[PDB]
């Protein structure tokens, strides 16, 4: 067969900001069991804001010019920006995380569009995107709401790669 | 129908060392035109110690802990064969071989291999590390322990994830 396709799949995010946005840092997990199965995210991200932050994964993996310069949610169904929740969502929509005063995030998620494995929702050698604000989810009625969530700027990232 | 299968491929790593090796860094650019298609690999790295230094991807992907971990983890090997140079019959996938560095630091790397796949096959070397050897890789044939495990390359340089483009 392809091993790609088989058994439990485990991804990691090292998670890192540079320039002023250099003390953000974290890493998250991702497991999915089987093809048809839940993927769960699990991690820390250190350093950030107070506050919601958007959590995307962008179309390109390519991390050779840093975090903070294609442009794009994954978004191999062509569908619209919306919340994880939400059926019309790109396969990188993975909503917002919060961080307190301490600026400390814990993430816990589970979601059921991505995949580790090599379908068309396949998220490996993919950027992981920690946002500047919230993601509206598609709800702000701002113009570019339903492009990506007018979530702003990147504060930190990182290649959803193999563990 | 998977666009993971189509077209050209283009993959590419940032290169990056760290602590006293943080001025290492490059990139290196992958491409595959189609499934079977030879995969050419192009880009320059800066900062190196003169002389020729192992190049190979690990079975890992994982950069949580940097470059320089304690895991010792294997060159990405799932067809079960012993280390060679890129030519050899007997070779790991992540096996690329030696890149050059010359006076001034700047290593150009320009290689060209038919094993490494951009397709989710099972040569797939996507989100996997790339890394550069504190020393040359022997092929297989120094003689050492290590010789037909690893190439006695030594420790790692600098490395990066194999990413889409
Ligand atoms: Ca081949
Ligand atoms: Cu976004
Ligand atoms: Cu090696
Ligand atoms: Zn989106
Ligand atoms: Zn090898």
């Known amino acids: 067969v392809n091993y790609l396709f088989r058994g439990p799949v485990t991804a990691v995010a ?14 998250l997990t991702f497991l999915q069991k089987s093809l048809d199965g839940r ?3 699990n991690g820390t991200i250190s350093g950030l804001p107070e506050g919601k932050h958007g959590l995307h994964i962008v179309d390109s993996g390519d991390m050779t010019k840093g975090c903070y310069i294609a442009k794009g949610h994954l978004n191999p169904f062509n569908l619209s920006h919306g ?10 929509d993975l909503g917002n995380i919060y961080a307190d005063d301490t ?10 569009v991505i995949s ?16 500047t604000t919230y993601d509206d989810l598609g709800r702000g009625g701002s113009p570019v709401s339903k492009v990506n ?15």
């Open 14 to 27: 090292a998670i890192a900001g540079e320039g002023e946005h250099a003390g953000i840092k974290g890493s």
């Open 83 to 92: 919340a994880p929740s939400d059926s019309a969502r790109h396969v990188g």
């Open 103 to 112: 600026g400390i995030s814990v993430i816990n998620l589970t979601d059921t």
């Open 39 to 41: 993927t769960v995210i």
């Open 149 to 163: 969530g007018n979530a702003g700027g990147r504060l930190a990232c990182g290649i959803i790669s193999y563990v």
């Open 116 to 131: 580790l494995f090599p379908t068309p929702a396949f998220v490996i050698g993919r950027i992981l995107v920690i946002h």
